[PDB]
Amino acid sequence: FEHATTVPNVPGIPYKALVERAGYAPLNLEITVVSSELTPSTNKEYVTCKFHTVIPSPQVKCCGSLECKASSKADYTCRVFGGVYPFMWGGAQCFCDSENTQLSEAYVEFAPDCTIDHAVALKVHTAALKVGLRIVYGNTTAHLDTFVNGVTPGSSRDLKVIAGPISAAFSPFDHKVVIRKGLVYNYDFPEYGAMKPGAFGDIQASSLDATDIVARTDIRLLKPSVKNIHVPYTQAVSGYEMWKNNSGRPLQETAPFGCKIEVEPLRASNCAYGHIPISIDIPDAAFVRSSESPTILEVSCTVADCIYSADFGGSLTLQYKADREGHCPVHSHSTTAVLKEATTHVTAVGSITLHFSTSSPQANFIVSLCGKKSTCNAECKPPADHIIGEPHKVDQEFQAAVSKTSWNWLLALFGGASSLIVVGLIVLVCSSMLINTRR
Amino acid sequence: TSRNFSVGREGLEYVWGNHEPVRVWAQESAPGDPHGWPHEIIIHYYHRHPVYTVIVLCGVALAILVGTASSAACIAKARRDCLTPYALAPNATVPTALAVLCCI
C-alpha cells in the first residue's frame, strides 16, 4: 500500500526502509536514485561567429557622379569619393583627369568555417528535474523514470510512485547562457539587435544560412591616397574572437553540487542536492501475512569493532532462535546508522553477522530481525584513513555527533551548576520562612 | 611541483590533463579521542568544528560555573539575614553549642 518517505537526492546511495503493515510481515524496500537530469526551458536568440568582411569590386564613374544607396546587408557602409584617377596594370581607367567619383562598399557575412566554430545564445527558464529510480521490494526489482514535481504519477509497472516537490530549487544556469562546441557558459549577452562593436554578439542571425543578418562592426571607409584602385578601410576586432580569448572557465568545471553539464539538450546530470519526497503504493501481492513469515522468539545484538566512516566500518552479530526456517528481513531504525544487507536466511538456531555505516561516535541503534527489535550498544573510534573515494551514506546529527562520555561530562557540569543554584534558592526560601515561623 | 587542496564531507573533484575526473571525500579522522579524557575529547572536537566547541560548549560551561557564585550569594544572604538578629532579648537563654560562636 502507501508508504511516504523522504529520500536524499544523492545518486548511487541506496535508501532502505521497512514498511510495517498492521497485519502483515514487515517488508523491505530500497529506493536508490540511479540518475537525475535537470533540463531547463531554452529559447535561441541568435547565432554568432567570426565575421568575414567583404569588399566588392569598386564602382567607378569617369566623368559623372554616384550616390550611396540603401541595403539590407549587415553593417553596410558606403562612401563616394570624387577627384579620383585610378590605375590598373594597363594604365589609367578614366578619360577625365578629375571629377571621376568612386564608390566604396563594405559589409560582413559569416565565415566559411562558422558551420563548426560558432556560438548559440540562449535564454533559460524554470528547470525541471527528472530522476531514474531503482526500487526493490521483497523479491522484485523495478526501474522507472519520474518527474519530481509532486503530481505526475511516475512510470510504475505494477506500482505507483509520486515524487516531489524537491526540497530546494537549484539551477546551475543563469538567465543567459551561450554554447560553443559543446561547452556551456553563463554569459550576459546583448539582446537581438543590440550589437556593440568589439564585443560578443556583434554579428547576429537566427541561423547560419539565414539571409537577414544584423551587424555592427564599426567599419570606416577612407579616402584612397594611392593611384592604383584601392578601397581602404579600418574596422573593429571580432567580438567573437575577443570572447574566445576572454571566455573564462566553462560550466563543466564550475557547476555546484557536482553536476555534469551536457548539451543536446542543455541539462545538468547527476547533481546531489536536497531531498526528494516519494510516495509509493506497493501491490498487495508483495505482502505476506505473519502466519507465513518466521517468528523468532529472541534476538541479541553484539557489536564488533566500529568506526564512523564513509564506508561500512562497523560489524555486528545477531543471535536468534526461530521456530522454523525462512527469509526474514533486517533493518536499522536510526537515521545515523545504515545496514549493508536487507534480508537474511534464519534457521532454528544460529547467528548472522551484519555490517553497517555510522556517522556517530556511539552505536546505540535498534536492529530488527523478522520484525523483532534488539538494542546494540558500543562506541566507535575515529577512522584512521583521512580520504576515501566514497560518499558518506548517512548524515551528521548534532545529537548523534557527541559521544556519550562527552554528554555525561557536560550534563554532570550543567547539572552540578543547576543543583547548586537550586540548593541556594531552597536555602534562601527556607531560612527566610524560618523568620515567619519564629515570629 | 605540488599543490594543496581542501576537501570536506561533501567532497572534491580534480581533473589532471586529459584524464578522467577523480572524486575524494573527507572523514572525521581528527586527532584526539571522543571516548577518552576531557582533554582528549576537547582536542578531537576542536578539529571537528572548532567554532562550535569553544563557544556553545566550553564558553557556556565556564559561564555556567560563574553562575554558582550567585548561589553562594544566597547562602551569604541566608547567613547574615539569620545572624543579624543578635541581641534584643533580655533575661533569656541560648544553646551551649552556639554560645561559643554567637559572641563573635
Phi, psi of A122 (to 5 degrees): -130, 145
Specify the residue for cell string 541506496: A14
Please answer yes or no on whether A258 and B73 come within 8 Å at the CB atom: no
Please answer yes or no on whether A417 and B65 come within 8 Å at the CB atom: yes
Please answer yes or no on whether A381 and B35 come within 8 Å at the CB atom: yes
Q: Is B59 on the interface with A (CB under 8 A)?
A: no
C-alpha to C-alpha distance for A367 and A373, rounded to whole angstroms: 6
Please answer yes or no on whether B68 and A420 come within 8 Å at the CB atom: yes
Q: Of A382, A12, A184, which is closest to residue B29 (Cα–Cα)?
A: A382
3-state percent breakdown (helix, strand, coil) of chain B, nearest 5: 50, 10, 45
Specify the residue for cell string 536524499: A8
The CA distance from B92 to the nearest CA of chain A, in Å, is: 15
> What type of residue sits at position A439?
R
C-alpha to C-alpha distance for B25 and A390, rounded to whole angstroms: 6
C-alpha to C-alpha distance for A376 and A390, rounded to whole angstroms: 26
Specify the residue for cell string 533493518: A331
Residue B47 near residue B32 (C-beta atoms within 8 A): yes
Residues in contact with A207: Cβ distance below 8 Å, sequence separation at least 6, in sequence order: A47
Solving technique for this entry?
cryo-EM
Residue A68 near residue A78 (C-beta atoms within 8 A): yes
Residue A356 Cα distances to A366, A394, A402, A404, A414, angstroms: 12, 11, 19, 20, 34
Terminal CA-to-CA distance of chain B, rounded, Å? 81
DSSP letter at A237 equals P
Q: Of A134, A127, A178, A182, which is closest to residue A154 (Cα–Cα)?
A: A134
**Is residue A291 classed exposed, middle or buried when 0-12, 13-18 and 19+ CB atoms within 10 A define those classes?**
exposed
Residue A78 Cα distances to A69, A81, A152, A403, B54, angstroms: 8, 10, 60, 82, 75
Specify the residue for cell string 549587415: A74
Please answer yes or no on whether B25 and A361 come within 8 Å at the CB atom: no
Distance of CA A239 to the CA centre of its chain: 31
How many Cβ atoms from other residues are within 10 Å of residue A390's Cβ? 17
The kind and range of the H/E element at A379 are: strand A378-379
Terminal CA-to-CA distance of chain A, rounded, Å? 74
**Cell numbers placing A306:** 566500529
Most distant CA pair in chain A: distance in Å? 140
Please answer yes or no on whether A258 and B11 come within 8 Å at the CB atom: yes
Please answer yes or no on whether A379 and B35 come within 8 Å at the CB atom: yes
Residue A267 near residue A39 (C-beta atoms within 8 A): yes
Give resolution in angstroms.
2.5
Q: Of A201, A172, A198, which is closest to residue A189 (Cα–Cα)?
A: A201
The three-class DSSP label of residue A405 is helix
- Length in residues, chain B: 104
Residue B82 near residue A437 (C-beta atoms within 8 A): no
Q: Of A186, A215, A213, which is closest to residue A198 (Cα–Cα)?
A: A215
> What type of residue sits at position A239?
G
C-alpha to C-alpha distance for A334 and A377, rounded to whole angstroms: 13
Buried b (16+ CB within 10 A) or exposed e, B69-87: eebeebeeebeeeeeeeee
> What type of residue sits at position B82?
C
CB-side exposure of A122: number of CA atoms within 13 Å?
A: 22
C-alpha to C-alpha distance for A270 and A258, rounded to whole angstroms: 7
The kind and range of the H/E element at A203 are: strand A203-204
Helices then strands, each counted (H, E), chain B: 4, 2
User: For residue A387, which residues of chain B lie inside 8 Å, CB to CB?
Assistant: 7, 24-27
Sheet holding A119-124: strands in order across?
A42-48, A119-124, A176-180, A183-186
Q: What angle do CA B18, B23, B25 make, to 5 degrees?
A: 155
Cross-strand pairs, B78 = none
Specify the residue for cell string 557564585: B69
**Cell numbers placing A113:** 568555417
The CA distance from B36 to the nearest CA of chain A, in Å, is: 8
**Cell numbers placing B58:** 566550553
Residue in B9, B67, B72 nearest the CB of A392: B9
Q: B32 in the Ramachandran plot: left (φ > 0), alpha (ψ -120 to 50) or beta? A: left
Residue A326 near residue A294 (C-beta atoms within 8 A): yes
Chain A interface residues (partner B, CB cutoff 8 A)? 253, 258, 308-310, 359, 361, 379, 381-392, 396, 403, 405-406, 409-410, 413-414, 417, 420-421, 423-425, 427-428, 430-432, 434-435
Residue A205 near residue A144 (C-beta atoms within 8 A): no
C-alpha to C-alpha distance for A152 and B43, rounded to whole angstroms: 51
How many Cβ atoms from other residues are within 10 Å of residue B50's Cβ? 10
Residues in contact with A422: Cβ distance below 8 Å, sequence separation at least 6, in sequence order: none
Residue A304 near residue A160 (C-beta atoms within 8 A): no
Residue in chain A lying closest to B31 (CA): A382
Which site among A410, A411, A419, A436 would you substitute to test the B interface, given the most B Cβ atoms closer than 10 Å to its Cβ?
A: A410
The CA distance from A308 to the nearest CA of chain B, in Å, is: 8
Distance of CA A211 to the CA centre of its chain: 39
C-alpha to C-alpha distance for A357 and A369, rounded to whole angstroms: 18
Which site among A9, A364, A403 would you substitute to test the B interface, given the most B Cβ atoms closer than 10 Å to its Cβ?
A: A403
